[model samples]
Target chain A: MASLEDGTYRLRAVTTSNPDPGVGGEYATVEGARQPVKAEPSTPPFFERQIWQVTRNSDGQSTIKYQGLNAPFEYGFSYDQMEQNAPVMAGDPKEYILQLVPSTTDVYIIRAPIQRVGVDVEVGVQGNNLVYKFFPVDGSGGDRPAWRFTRE
Target chain B: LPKSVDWRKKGYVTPVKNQKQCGSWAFSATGALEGQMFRKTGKLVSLSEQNLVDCSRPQGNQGCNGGFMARAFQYVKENGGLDSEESYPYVAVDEICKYRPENSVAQDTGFTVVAPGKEKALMKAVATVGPISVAMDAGHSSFQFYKSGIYFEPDCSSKNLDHGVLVVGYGFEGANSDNSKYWLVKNSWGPEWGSNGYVKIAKDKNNHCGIATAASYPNV
Candidate 1:
C-alpha cells in the first residue's frame, strides 16, 4: 500500500469499543433512558472523548499520538487500512497502540478506547532496502509529541 | 499429517547453534520461498532456519519479542510486500502441523508409539496440554517437572533455568530422571542445544519449584 501524504490526522471518532454488548442486550441503552438497553458508560464520561494526531515528520516517516486519557499512548503506522472502517494500516513499520480504559461501571468493558500511536516512513534507500524511521512523542509527562523512526 | 519425511530425513534438530541465523531463515523462507509456493502452486513447503533469519531479522529482538507473524504482516501491509531484510519471519505450529504430524507415545505402555497411535488424538492432546511450568528453584538454574504424566526433556542445563519450557514427549527408560520414567521436553532456545533440542527428565521428579503449570498455545 502506498503511504498517505504527510498531513495532520486527528481522531475522527471511536466507532467501536472493545467488549461490545450483543444486539438489543441490556447494556445497549444508557441508564434512565426510555429504552432499557445496555450501555458501557465511560468513567468521568469526559475521558470518552479520545483523539489522535498523525504527523508525517520532516523525514518521510509518520507518527501517531493519542490523547484524552490519564496517559497518552502511541503506536507507529505505515500501511493503509485494507478496509477504511477498520483501524488497520500499512507500511513496514506498521504498528498501533490501543488504550485500555477499564470501565468503572461494567465488567464487560474489558478494553478501552484505542488510538493509533506512532509510525515509521521511508525516507530514502539504504544499501539494498529502503530506510524507515519512527519518532515517539511521549504523552506521559508533557503535551509535546516525540518523533523517531528507523530504516529497513 | 505425517511428520515431514523430508524434514525428518533431513534430520531436523533443535536449539539451533545460531538463533539469529536460523531465526532469520525461519521468517524469510516462510514468506518469499515457501509462501510463494503455497500461493501459486497451492503446495506448501517446509521453511529452513537459514531462510527465516535473514528475511525477518531487520531489527532483531525488536521484531521478535512482539508477535513475529504480526510484525511480518505489518511489514507486508505497509511496504506493499515483504523485503529480504525488512520483515520479521515466523510460521505457526499449525502451519507446520499441516504437513508434519507430531510424534506420539502410547497412553499406558509408556513406549513411544510413533507410527500406530491416533494422530489427531495425539495432536489434540498435545496441543491442549499447557507448558510444563516450573517456579524458580533455590539456585534458579534448573526447572522441575510437576505433571505426573510422562513427557520428554531435551536439555540438561547446568545453568539457572529462569525460563519456561514445554514437555513434548516421554517414555520409560532405565536411566531416566525418574529412574523408571523418561519425559521429552521442548525448549524455546531454538534447535541446536540439548538432546537434538529437548530434555529428558524423570516422570515424577520435582526439579525446579515442584509446581506444575501446564502449557497451551493461546486460542486465536
Candidate 2:
C-alpha cells in the first residue's frame, strides 16, 4: 500500500452531520494553549498550528507533531470521557500511536486504542466549531468525520 | 531512533509461533508480511507459514530444508498472495502445494532488501518502516537457549546468515548507566523459548550474527 510520505500536512475534518455543513477544517489549539488540540475552520493564519509533521511507520501508523510548537500528538484522553468531547492533547514529545486507516483516496480515519479502554476509537469532530473527540469505531455517537491530509 | 520503539506495544507485531523442524524462513517471511498486511488494511491476520513452505519451492525455497524471506515474498506476490492459517494450517513438515488464490488473505507487491551489514540502515527501517525480516546466525548454543536480557554472541558468524527472524523494535537498557542497546527480535521457536519467543540482540555491536545482513521487508 502507498504510505504517506514523511512531511507536513494540513488535516481537514470532513463530515456531513446535520445542522453543520462545514466540510474542511484543521486541528488547532484552544487560544494557542499547548495542551489540547481542538478543531476549527481552515484559517490560513493558523497554518502552523493546523499543519502537522507526519512520520509514518511501515505498519501504516503515524506519529504526528504539531508544526507550530513541534509538539507530538498523543491520545492523552481517557475512555471514560467517551460521553464527552475528550480533548486530544499535544504532548511535549509523544504517547499513543495513530493508526491511519484509509477511508477514501487520500482521506483516512485517524484512530488509536486507549490503554484504559483497550478498544480502538477514531479521532473526530463533534458539535459546532468542530470540537475534536474520540468516537467509537462504529461511529455510534456524534458526527465523527474522516480526515483528509493536504500538503502544507 | 527516538530513544526506543516496540511494534509489539502497538498492534503491528503478531503472536509467537512454533516452527518446529520446519525452517524459520517461512515464519520470518510471514511475520514481516503480516506486519505489512496489518499496516495497510488494519487487519492482523495470521498468514499460513505452510503456504510458503509448501508452495515457494519454485522460488528456490526448500520447504523444511531452508529458504530466504525475500524469496518467500516473491513467491507470495507472484502466486497472488497467501492464505490464512485457518485455510492452510502449518504441518511443520513439507507437503505438496495446496495453495489456492481463493483462500488468499494477504498480499504484497514486492520487497526491498535493506543495505547489507548496515545497522544504521536497519535501525532506520525498523524505527520508521515497521517490522523487518532479518537473517542472522542462530548456531550458538547461547542463542538456542536464549532466555532473557540483551543477547550478544561475539563469536557468532556474520557471514553465515543461518536463521531468519523478525526485527520488531529496538531500545537501550540504560541511557545514563549501562546504555545496553539492543534489537527486539521475534523468533519462531514458540513462546516457551526466549522471552515469549522474542530476543533483544545487541544493537550497534558490529551487527553481531549478521542481523543486518540480508534484511528485507515486503512492500504492500
Candidate 3:
C-alpha cells in the first residue's frame, strides 16, 4: 500500500484481444474505423483530442478526471474502431493542457497536438504517484490495465 | 334548535373543536379532499396520518415509497394538513431542512428527532413542506428531490424494474443499519433495513439528489 501524497498522473490506453470473434471481429474492419469519429475539439486550430486524468490511491483504485466542460465531451468512436486497432494512440492526453493566464486568475486555453504513440504522456495525479489505465470499448477485460509512476 | 343543541347533534364534541370544532372538522374535510379535490386545490387533504397512510396504500399492488410522497402532499394540501401523530412520520431531521426551502437558514443545525414509534410523524411533516412526486424510470439507484420530497423506487428481485425513486423529505442525515445517510429515502426495499431500510442518498452541495426528473403536487 502507498501513502497519501499529491501530484499529477495521465490516462493511457491498454488493449486486449476480444475472446469471441462474433463480438469483436465484426468491429475490426477499416470502414468500421471511419464511422464518423470525432474527438474533444480544441477551442480552435487544434484537432483530434481525447484526454483524461488519472488519480491513483494506495489501495490500488484510481479516480478518473477530465477537463471541466460545460457539457461532458462525447467523442464519437464506433465499437469497430476499438475492435480494429485495439488501443490506438488517439492522441497525447497532455496536449489538452490547462494554463493560468497572467492578468486573470482563471485558467486560459491553449491548443496543442496530441503526442504520437510511445511518447511520454501526462494523465494527472494519483495520491503521491501518477497513473494510467487501458479501457476496451467493448467492455472486455485485460491485464492490470493501469500503470503508475512515482515522483523521484 | 338552539346553537348548543345543533352543535351536540352535529357531533362537534371534541375539545379541540370548540373553535367551531375547528380541528376535527378540518381533519374530516381534508380527509375527503382526494382525486378531484387534489386536482383542483393542488393538495391532497387528509384527516389523520392513518388517512394519509391509507390513501398511500399501494394502488393495485403498486409500490409505496415513490408515489407515497406525491399522494400525501396532494392529500394534505387540498385537505388543509393532517392532525394525527403531532410530530410527522418517517421524516429525518436533515431531510426537513433540505426540502423546506424556507428553512435554508437551518442548514447546519443537525436536529433529527425520531419518536419511539412515530416514524409516520416524520412522513407527515415531509408532506407539509410541499408537493411530492415520484419518478418511475429515473435511471439511477439513488433518490432525488423533484420538487420537495425525495423520489426512489423500491429494490426488487428483478432487473427490469430497477429504474426509479421516491422523494421522502429533507431531514437530518444519519445512518441506520447500513451506515449511510445523506437523504431519508422511503424505498420499496420491502420493509427491511433502516426504517424499512430506506435509502440514504449522498447530499449534493445543494442537498438534493442529482437525478430527479419529474414531479407533481396537489392543488388545495
Candidate 4:
C-alpha cells in the first residue's frame, strides 16, 4: 500500500500461558509407572508495552527508536540488510535486509538484529498505522511471552 | 591473511552459511576449507557441499543425518575435489551425487584427524593453516539464542560431538586470547545465530565444548 509513515508508535505481543498444547514433554517415574511431564515454557512472567520513535531516512534505511523499558534514552533499530548481507569474517555483525511483510498490513523481519542493549524486533503495518512485536526469550518458565505496540 | 584472523573477510572463506535442518555441517566446513584452498592457490573456485552429502555416502558419510568432517575430506580428496557451489548448491537434504572429475576444485592430499586431546596443536594448526574443520557439542539450549560473547559453557560436555564447523581464528577475550583466549569459529546456522553466524568459543579451558575433540581439514 504505502510506506511506513515516520512517527512514534506503541508495540505489543500476543502469547498465552499454555503456549503449546501438543506437548508431551517428558515422562517421570511414578511408583514404577511412567507419567508425562507437562510441557511448559522454560521462562515465565513476560513484560508488556513499549513506545518507540520510528523513522525512514532518505537512504532507504528504516529505523525504530524507543525509550527502552529499562532506560530513559532512545534505542535505534536500523534496516540495511539489502546492502549488508555479505560474507564477512567472524566478529562482524551479520546484516538482514528489511523485509516488508504484510498480513492485512506491512511487516518487517530484522535477522538477529540485536546487541548488548539492543534486541531483535519486528514491525508491521496495520492499515495506515505501525505495528510491532518483541519476544526476548530469557530461558525462564514464563508464559504470555509476547508484546505489541501501536502508533501513540 | 598470514596473521591470526577470520579468513572469510580475507576471501579465504565464504559467507556464514546455514545447513538449515540438515546434518550436513561436514559439507559446510569442507566448503569453507575449499574456499580457503582456492584463495591460497588462486584457483578461486567455489565447491559444493552437496557433493559430499550425496557422493560421500560410499565412504560412510551420512547425508543430512550427521556425518564426520574427516569422512568428507576423504570424499573430496578421493573424488579429485568437488564442483562449485553454483554447480551443485546446497539443498540441505540428501540427493544424488552428480560430481564430475572436471568439476573438482582441489586435490585431496588427504586430511589429519589430529591427536586426541590436543588443544594447543589445534591453535597452532589454525595459525599456520587457514581454517580448520572442527566439530562440537552444539545441542545445548543456550546455543539457540547465542548473540555475542566469548561463549563459555562449562556444563557443555567435551564428549558432545554432534555438529561441524570451521575454526577461522583465535585470540583472547579481555586482554587477548593469550590471556583470556577464544577460538573464532564459523557455524552453519546462518547469520541470525551467535555472532552473525560465527562463535568465539572460550579456549584455554581444556577444550570447553569438545571443539578439539574431533577436528580435521583438507590437505590441499
Predicted model with the maximum TM-score: 2
For model 3, the docking class works out as incorrect
Sort by TM-score, best first: 2, 4, 1, 3
Model 3: residue B25 alpha-carbon error in angstroms = 32
**Clash pairs (backbone) in predicted model 2:** A1-B220, A58-B129, A59-B39
> Could you tell me the TM-score of chain B in model 3?
0.28
Give the TM-score of each candidate. Answer: 0.27, 0.58, 0.21, 0.57
Give the interface RMSD of candidate 2. 25.7
lDDT of 1 by residue, B45-71 (tens): 443332222233342212111113323
Q: List each candidate's DockQ score.
A: 0.02, 0.01, 0.01, 0.02
* Model 2 error, position B11 (Å): 0.4
Native-referenced DockQ of model 1: 0.02
Better of 2 and 4 by TM-score: 2
- On residues B162-186, what C-alpha lDDT tens digit does candidate 3 reach at each position? 1223344444434442223234443
Please report the candidate that would top lDDT against the real structure.
2
Provide the RMSD of all predictions against the true structure, rounded to 1 decimal. Answer: 19.8, 20.9, 22.4, 18.6
**lDDT (C-alpha) at residue A33 in model 4:** 11
DockQ of 4: 0.02
Q: Write the per-residue lDDT of candidate 2 for residues A94-131, one digit (tens) a residue.
A: 32344334334555556553546755556665432323
Residues B1-220, candidate 2: write the lDDT tens digits. Answer: 5668898887997789987634437888999998989889988999999998888868767565456789889998899889999999998766899988899999988899999999999989998889999988775568877889999977887885567889999898975422798989998878888988789999888988899988999998
